[PDB]
Amino acid sequence: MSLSPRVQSLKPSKTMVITDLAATLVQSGVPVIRLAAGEPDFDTPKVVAEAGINAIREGFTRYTLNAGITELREAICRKLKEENGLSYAPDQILVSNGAKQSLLQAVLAVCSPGDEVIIPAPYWVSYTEQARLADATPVVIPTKISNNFLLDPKDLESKLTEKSRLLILCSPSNPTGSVYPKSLLEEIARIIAKHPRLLVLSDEIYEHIIYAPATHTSFASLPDMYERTLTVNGFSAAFAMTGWRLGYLAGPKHIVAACSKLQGQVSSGASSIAQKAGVAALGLGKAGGETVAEMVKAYRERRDFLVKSLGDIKGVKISEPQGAFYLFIDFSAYYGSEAEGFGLINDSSSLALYFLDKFQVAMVPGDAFGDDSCIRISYATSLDVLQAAVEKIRKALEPLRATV
Amino acid sequence: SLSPRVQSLKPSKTMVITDLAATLVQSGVPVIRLAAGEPDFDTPKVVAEAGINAIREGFTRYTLNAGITELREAICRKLKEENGLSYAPDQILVSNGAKQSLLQAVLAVCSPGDEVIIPAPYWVSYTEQARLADATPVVIPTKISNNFLLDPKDLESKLTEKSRLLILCSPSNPTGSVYPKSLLEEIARIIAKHPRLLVLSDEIYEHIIYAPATHTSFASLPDMYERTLTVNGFSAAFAMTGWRLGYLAGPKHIVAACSKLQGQVSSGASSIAQKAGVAALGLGKAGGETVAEMVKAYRERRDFLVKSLGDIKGVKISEPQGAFYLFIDFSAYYGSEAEGFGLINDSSSLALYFLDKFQVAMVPGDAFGDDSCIRISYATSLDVLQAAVEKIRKALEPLRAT
Numbered sequence: 001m002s003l004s005p006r007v008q009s010l011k012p013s014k015t016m017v018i019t020d021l022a023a024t025l026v027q028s029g030v031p032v033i034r035l036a037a038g039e040p041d042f043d044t045p046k047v048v049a050e051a052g053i054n055a056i057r058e059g060f061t062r063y064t065l066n067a068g069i070t071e072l073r074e075a076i077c078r079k080l081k082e083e084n085g086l087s088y089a090p091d092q093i094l095v096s097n098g099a100k101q102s103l104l105q106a107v108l109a110v111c112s113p114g115d116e117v118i119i120p121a122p123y124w125v126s127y128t129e130q131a132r133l134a135d136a137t138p139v140v141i142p143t144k145i146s147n148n149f150l151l152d153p154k155d156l157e158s159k160l161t162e163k164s165r166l167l168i169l170c171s172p173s174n175p176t177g178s179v180y181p182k183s184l185l186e187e188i189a190r191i192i193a194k195h196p197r198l199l200v201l202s203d204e205i206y207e208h209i210i211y212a213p214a215t216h217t218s219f220a221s222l223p224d225m226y227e228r229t230l231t232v233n234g235f236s237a238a239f240a241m242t243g244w245r246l247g248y249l250a251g252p253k254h255i256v257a258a259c260s261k262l263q264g265q266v267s268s269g270a271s272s273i274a275q276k277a278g279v280a281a282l283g284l285g286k287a288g289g290e291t292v293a294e295m296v297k298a299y300r301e302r303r304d305f306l307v308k309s310l311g312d313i314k315g316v317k318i319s320e321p322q323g324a325f326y327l328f329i330d331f332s333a334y335y336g337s338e339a340e341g342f343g344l345i346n347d348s349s350s351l352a353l354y355f356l357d358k359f360q361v362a363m364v365p366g367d368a369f370g371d372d373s374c375i376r377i378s379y380a381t382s383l384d385v386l387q388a389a390v391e392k393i394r395k396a397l398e399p400l401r402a403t404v
Numbered sequence: 405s406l407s408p409r410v411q412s413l414k415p416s417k418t419m420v421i422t423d424l425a426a427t428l429v430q431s432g433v434p435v436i437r438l439a440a441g442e443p444d445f446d447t448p449k450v451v452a453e454a455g456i457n458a459i460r461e462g463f464t465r466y467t468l469n470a471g472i473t474e475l476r477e478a479i480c481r482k483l484k485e486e487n488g489l490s491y492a493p494d495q496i497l498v499s500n501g502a503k504q505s506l507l508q509a510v511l512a513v514c515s516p517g518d519e520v521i522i523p524a525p526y527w528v529s530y531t532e533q534a535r536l537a538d539a540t541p542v543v544i545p546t547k548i549s550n551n552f553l554l555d556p557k558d559l560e561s562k563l564t565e566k567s568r569l570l571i572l573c574s575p576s577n578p579t580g581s582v583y584p585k586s587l588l589e590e591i592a593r594i595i596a597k598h599p600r601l602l603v604l605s606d607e608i609y610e611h612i613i614y615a616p617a618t619h620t621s622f623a624s625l626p627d628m629y630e631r632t633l634t635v636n637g638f639s640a641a642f643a644m645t646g647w648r649l650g651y652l653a654g655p656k657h658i659v660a661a662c663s664k665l666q667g668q669v670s671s672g673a674s675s676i677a678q679k680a681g682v683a684a685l686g687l688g689k690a691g692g693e694t695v696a697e698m699v700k701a702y703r704e705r706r707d708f709l710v711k712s713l714g715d716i717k718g719v720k721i722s723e724p725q726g727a728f729y730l731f732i733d734f735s736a737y738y739g740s741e742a743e744g745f746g747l748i749n750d751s752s753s754l755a756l757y758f759l760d761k762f763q764v765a766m767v768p769g770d771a772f773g774d775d776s777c778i779r780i781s782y783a784t785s786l787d788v789l790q791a792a793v794e795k796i797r798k799a800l801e802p803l804r805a806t
């Protein structure tokens with residue numbers, strides 16, 4: 001009848017909205033090029049799928065420990081040691097139904113009403129809303145495509161207040177594909193250390209989707225940052241396990257125990273089947289081994305195809321991504337254009353709608369990520385689909401003019 | 405250094421004791437585990453094969469947030485065929501287990517300061533989910549001599565302008581009580597008078613029901629459809645606990661809010677599990693012969709425990725009409741002192757007594773809002789239950805009743 005004010009004012013995830021719009025259009029017989037959700041074209045690796053199948057076959061279908069099965073949490077600690085140089089005990093790991101839930105629980109457990117959550121823009125669409133679910137206050141810090149959308153520490157200093165409680169860092173980034181260098185992280189950490197109440201939420205789900213010579217640095221590995229950092233990772237992106245629903249949190253014992261307690265009242269311990277598939281995934285070796293190296297090579301090739309293709313287009317500004325499977329494309333020079341049969345294109349929403357309604361390409365408008373000057377394309381899908389999309393994007397813009 | 409709501413949040417005592425027992429068994433200490441309400445049946449063969457086929461066929465991608473279309477239409481068919489309810493597929497939201505379904509429902513409709521009415525004994529998570537919404541749980545006690553069923557007078561006595569949600573769990577966890585249609589009807593007439601008061605109807609144990617008892621969906625009563633949120637799922641009926649799959653059905657506007665919320669919380673339920681769910685609903689009305697065998701087994705175990713534990717001096721038992729739990733009144737022994745343990749004067753010290761000294765894990769009633777009882781799950785083998793009964797008798801023997 002009359003929804004709670006928090007849920008009433010909650011913004012829908014535009015990523016979910018557009019993806020489900022595209023899926024529904026396709027299913028009703030309208031072909032749509034789907035570049036919204038970051039969903040790999042690859043199958044789950046054979047050995048991972050076999051582990052899940054074997055779990056079902058051997059009756060591994062009962063409730064697990066809330067925090068996750070012992071074998072998985074131990075494998076996760078081995079991963080964090082070997083890949084990230086971090087030391088956790090198995091009771092500092094909380095396994096959830098994907099990283100989105102891992103993130104939400106972390107926010108809810110450490111943020112009190114009125115606490116400020118500091119979020120660099122462009123940001124993954126759910127960070128601001130999860131903060132509002134906690135009665136917290138999002139503090140967005142804009143970044144510049146000229147600075148590869150990386151947080152400027154001076155801007156961080158200028159936004160700190162007594163109410164500052166949580167800084168969210170996403171690297172490699174969704175939507176920009178930026179990778180934070182160690183040097184910049186070390187500077188940010190020095191700011192964090194001077195403020196006793198300040199925690200860092202480090203979202204590292206795209207860790208293995210990284211292109212040489214970029215390298216990934218876990219924020220929790222920096223000086224004084226271990227006791228301050230909640231580390232969220234998962235299986236969706238690296239191992240093409242999006243439909244399995246499996247992610248995890250690692251951090252200080254007292255915070256992980258509060259998240260676990262919260263998870264005990266909001267869900268039971270992730271799927272028993274997915275957790276077994278998870279230990280097979282981690283069994284693949286350091287950084288997912290050659291299984292993941294093959295997927296990364298493919299993503300890197302799709303990346304290069306897109307940067308070349310769209311980059312050449314008049315007015316288009318691109319930050320060449322260093323990780324993840326997203327291009328955050330600046331088409332803002334086209335804003336103000338009048339497209340025949342459609343109308344005014346003056347922001348990312350109307351541009352994305354134009355691409356979708358007239359050329360059947362589904363992308364996510366930058367405004368959902370806190371930056372209206374850009375559009376997000378996922379290149380997790382096939383090269384064939386990406387080539388088709390580029391031809392249509394070219395056609396789509398041929399009628400409009402780029403400002404100078 | 406934690407949020408006030410998570411700081412004060414009570415841990416699920418069912419989850420705590422269950423995990424405790426499993427760990428003990430791992431350290432090499434045998435425990436009779438009667439805590440978690442978990443079927444000993446395998447996932448049914450056709451259901452498991454559907455999950456296997458889903459994986460083999462590459463159905464390992466993100467689904468529609470609200471749930472795959474095939475599952476949501478199958479759920480609507482089931483709600484019509486079994487419960488007499490008419491929902492459209494976009495009135496269904498599929499989640500990672502029913503636990504999540506109840507939470508999102510509570511968060512969506514309860515504003516701060518709103519009151520959530522919860523008949524005691526209650527399933528442990530209802531009060532805590534209410535507090536996550538900044539709502540106030542209003543608990544209405546019930547009595548074993550009344551089969552732990554709500555008194556309509558007591559309900560109407562507790563209503564305020566702030567009453568927003570009433571939670572009806574039938575068949576009940578922890579009591580196994582089943583709400584008769586006539587009681588439900590009288591509750592409805594009280595409800596149909598307060599325009600803010602919604603009903604959350606948790607029907608997860610609907611198929612675990614013992615004749616001549618029968619399940620009545622609250623949403624089927626006159627004028628209640630528009631105010632009822634129906635929560636159900638697969639874990640109890642189809643023994644799919646390991647799978648995490650549940651759903652909510654309700655008014656389009658509330659379901660849309662829950663889906664919007666889930667889109668920020670967890671996204672869609674697993675693709676694999678939803679495929680298995682389609683197969684489970686494919687077994688036919690009430691799960692067909694597959695579920696019939698399960699119910700028959702549970703009824704047998706129930707009858708064994710009720711008879712065994714019943715003739716113990718100072719043990720009182722409401723014989724359950726559904727679910728897989730016994731809510732047993734051992735309070736005649738409160739005030740006893742056991743040599744080697746100490747004073748036993750509430751459900752927590754008695755449950756701890758049973759576990760520490762006799763290695764039987766049960767969940768104390770205090771977690772369910774009623775300290776006079778202890779909950780036993782009997783979704784395990786007859787041989788395990790025989791052992792539990794001997795150990796319980798032996799534990800009670802040194803003690804004295806009334």
Ligand SMILES: Cc1ncc(COP(=O)(O)O)c(CN)c1O
Nearest residue numbers: 098099100124174203234236247
């Ligand atoms: C940065 C970020 N964090 C977390 C998630 C959630 O992923 P999932 O719930 O599928 O594990 C996503 C989804 N792509 C993401 O991009």
Ligand SMILES: Cc1ncc(COP(=O)(O)O)c(CN)c1O
Nearest residue numbers: 501502503527577608637639650
């Ligand atoms: C009354 C009730 N509702 C919901 C649940 C949650 O079940 P699940 O999340 O596994 O579907 C349970 C678990 N037995 C329950 O007892």
